[model samples]
Target chain A: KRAPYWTNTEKMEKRLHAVPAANTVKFRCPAGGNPMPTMRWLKNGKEFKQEHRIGGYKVRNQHWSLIMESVVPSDKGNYTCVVENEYGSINHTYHLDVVERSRHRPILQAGLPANASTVVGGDVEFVCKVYSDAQPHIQWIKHVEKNGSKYGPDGLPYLKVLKHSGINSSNAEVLALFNVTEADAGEYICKVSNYIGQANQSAWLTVLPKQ
Target chain B: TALTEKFNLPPGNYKKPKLLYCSNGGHFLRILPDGTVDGTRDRSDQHIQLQLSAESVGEVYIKSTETGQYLAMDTDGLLYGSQTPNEECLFLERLEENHYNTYISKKHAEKNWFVGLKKNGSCKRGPRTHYGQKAILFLPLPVSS
Candidate 1:
């Protein structure tokens, strides 16, 4: 007899970066073992009751389905769906992140740093904040004089987002430099954009000797 | 008799708000201690219940059965489950096509913030652009045997 096993390896903690809207989110689980499994949902180790403004429907007549519609900020939290049978039981937990939209064009609230100089060989945070009508995605661009080139989002080097930053945000809140060299010193632009329009702010960087 | 018909209650209010929390999606409105606005989760006395207003059939005055605080939404769109009933505290219950009762502020009928719950058990306001399942549902609690 086999214990209930998930057909696919879903992450124990799922992060959903969804846009604000009247949307639907669902989690499906299909498992089979010695005995037929029954599904139940829980919150903070307590049974989740389908109360007003919320409902759950079964999928495929055997699997468990958890659904939420028209998501908002407060809806961000942890959840679990437990599947149980005589043989054994298995549960999956999920963490939801609902990114709210600003909806308006990204207005430059905190402009970029002034063209300045700072010591090299140190981590620097070029931080800026811009409030948008909708949550605007921030972009980082650097211009070097040697080739008179501007490096922004590209298909070659593929400017990737940093895994971790000062703030728990995915935006280019700062162009955090791990180590500084003269080559790293250049003019950087922080561009914020959304469906409405785009805005750009710039600042200069200086990589000095670590003295 | 006037008091009974006036307040729109049978006689006594032996009820609890029973903090209606959803898995996700909506503004969180919580009943604080001194009767102000708050956003947090609590299964204790913070939960509130609905007390139908005698003024109108669909109108309601949310009472904090937990601490006897009156629930109100301010002009700033803040959910305050404290103090007594005021203009901002008053809400009109509009039954939608989905049968869910959405509460609209009497002061600003154009602004409709339905009763919504968060995963943390805090009650809050919801969108008014349209009525969906996320809108608060006002139904009698099932009889517990």
Candidate 2:
């Protein structure tokens, strides 16, 4: 006899939500009407089907709840919860964004040791082997001493960027210095950075005259 | 001595001394007194100090400040330090959009040969060079007095 109206939209009427992939997501749309209201769910303007139930989607009339047991990337869209009575129908839309979880920031699986001693005219390679859930950019830099200066600002040496492996999805990258001389002796840094954060590892190259 | 005075006569040519730092090789271009052209890793090597003379807007003459020899390429694109500056020593110096410069031999301009250096401080054959190649790129750094 009365129109279906949302009971508690004040607290639970959030329109936007960011969810991690393969995680459970629950949405409540408690509505009330004189005649019992029938609840239905739609995703991206399409009504849910039997296949959706097999994909771990459950819409319950208990509290007008929509539960996705294991949300996937394909489940990310505008989810509408519609409730209808004999009098009128009411609907609420929720936007779900499924994002990849940042479980691994950056793991340096293999890299150069603390010190690499080589002679002038010898070749050296600094390896940066890393693994991350998110794609990372690998950068190699050298800290060279300034002219007649012991240290720079903040007691750090001057930095000279040598190479950049842009947006590396692979695990390994290397900076090779061939026919190195005394000028190449410095603190070499291997930096791995992503949108989330950054990590760094460094090694010192000690170049001695030919012996 | 000016390149014009050393060579024949060019109407308008300006020269500037600089250090040609190889981008991929991480070395400086060096010309020896024995008419040998190679890459030197030492930044303070006096042999690596070079004088580049602009024969025209994009044309240049590369000379070694220490050896007074001009960098020249032969018909087979072989790079050498020539005691005499000739047309083979003339190079088309172009600053690429990547902020690096490419030195193409004017004599081999039809073949598009570039001054190339390998990562091992060795010279790459000009015929094996191309545009946008890291080995063919050089960064001109100011010579510190």
Candidate 3:
């Protein structure tokens, strides 16, 4: 007697896109197989090497990410992703277009303290400014607290902003301390981040006893 | 003379009433009209007198010996007693009133064994160790209030 015979079926799909002319290009192939497949990369009928011209790539469980560094006009060529398994083999090819890198940087600024010195029971305000093509995410993180050294036994040395507002525009301000105390005296950091870049600034707050 | 003699009674004819008391020997101790004891028995065993005088009528004197038994009274007014050897053996008097259940003697208090887990994985014997398998048994402190 003989055992039953079976045949394995393998499938391949191709995906392609265009990147900027001066920037890097990344390609990914998400495929699935029973007995996992091994992926290989080919650029214009030549075996790709992981060098300065061709950045490294990875073959994960069911996906592959191919990266090319410093793409030029000559890099606008054919790219292939070949997958092989013990049962069968599959392949995918894509045409990439390289374009120029966009020339734009976001403008980020931080406002000065409203008062040079604030009383222990007074309020203070600081402003941050940013101008960019892309919408930015503005945040205020205490650098002293984040550094893990400026906290007292209560575990936070500075009194942060009681209410934070105006974080959606190119320019924003935050008012802090409804009722300031001796421990409310410290440095405050304002950070603004957009898709293009991020900027940060710090300011000092002084608190004095009520005369 | 006849009329005066009928109206005047004789001196010895106006005598006082006598009093008498019943005895256990089926005889009455008689008292004369002059309030004197007359014909009273002198029985030796009957000399254990219960004085009924005004001074001793309401007096109650109770004396108990060390070897006497203790009478236990339950809520239902039922009396039960137990004699002591050298010391009193205290126990749970009754499990339930009007029922036949009673508690075990005091000597069996520590003899009942209970199984439970200890911190050191040892079995502590008695109701003190009666807990869940994951219970922790802390030793008694010397100065616990």
Candidate 4:
């Protein structure tokens, strides 16, 4: 007969493991625990440095995520996310891939009369044109006296008319002068400016006498 | 010009002294019987000029070219008298609307007295006189050629 003694059997198991890829990765952890677990990331076995170039991403309140900006080919690498607690630590590795592509460049055009020359007492028109991804503002200016004298010594000596054409498109036109004179002969400059860049052009107007 | 000559009495022995021309502004010309050739309408007697012998004349005359009105001051004792002959012209006083009056009597000459009355019927004597003095009187006549 065996001695009157009791035997107890209890088994301790290892924590489970989880692996996640770095494709726009997001992470979450449990709440309320002693020695809370911390989450960290490493790229190619080196610690990751968060910067403006890395875009804005945050990890707080048991939540974490990383966003990439225009992921380039060089961004491809092995990334690891490790979550640690006082009791133990766990980590996951991921392989990432970046693709590259090209974006179109905005174009600008001109919208004006084919010919700017006119008779001394004739009519003329001016226009500016642009075809761009961004809307551009167009302005017209006449190179006159520093005082902005748009008239003659005897007061306004010429008649002028202005008309605007086209909508959302960067195309505009202005019709001016029912009767032109020698004073009307000058460089008419059209300036087009936008968030990306600015462009300007000038056209010479010649007022000739009628034959 | 005719009026200028008419009022240009030989500066002496005239019954009515003429008001000589003075500087003009707009429609008004300051006229004074005892005023200098460069007539001054200013209250300061500094602009007055008169001939001593002219005091013998009984009356003083003043003229305005603009109104063509002749201002006469009777030289009777009412204005100035012979007592202040030198001041006889001092008695010159405005009478009617544009008229002036003064006395050039022989009695005034005897008294060797000079007196003057103003538009407000107030009386005054020579040299030491101020605006409130009412009448303006001149003693040592203006310097003459």
Clashing pairs in 2: none
Report the CAPRI category for model 4: incorrect
Top candidate on lDDT is 2
lDDT of 3 by residue, B35-108 (tens): 22222322121211211100111111110122233322222222233342211222221112211112212333
- Model 3 residue A93 CA deviation (Å) reads 45
How does chain A of every candidate compare to the true chain A by TM-score?
A: 0.46, 0.57, 0.38, 0.37
Which lDDT tens digits does candidate 2 get at residues B28-89? 78888887677876767888888765443346678888878999888888789998778899
As a TM-score, model 3 comes out at 0.25
Q: Measured with DockQ on alpha carbons, how good is candidate 3?
A: 0.00
Model 3 chain B lDDT-worst window of ten? B53-62
TM per model? 0.37, 0.37, 0.25, 0.24
**Per-residue lDDT of A1-211 in model 4, one digit per residue for the tens?**
1211111111101111111112242333322234655677777788877652245345664343344533434455666666666766666555553321111122334444334888878888775554422223455666666356656777753433122222221324343657888888877766554334566666788888888
For each candidate in the order shown, give its overall lDDT on alpha carbons: 0.51, 0.70, 0.38, 0.38
Chain B TM-score in each of the candidates: 0.60, 0.86, 0.17, 0.22
Q: Give a tens-digit lDDT track for model 4, residues B1-145.
A: 2122211112111212222211111011132334212223332332233321111111232333333333222343333212122322332222111111222223344443334433322332333233333233221211220
Q: Candidate 2: where are CA atoms >4 Å away?
A: A105-211, B1-145
True contacts kept of 1: 0.00
Q: How close is candidate 2 to the true structure, as a TM-score?
A: 0.37
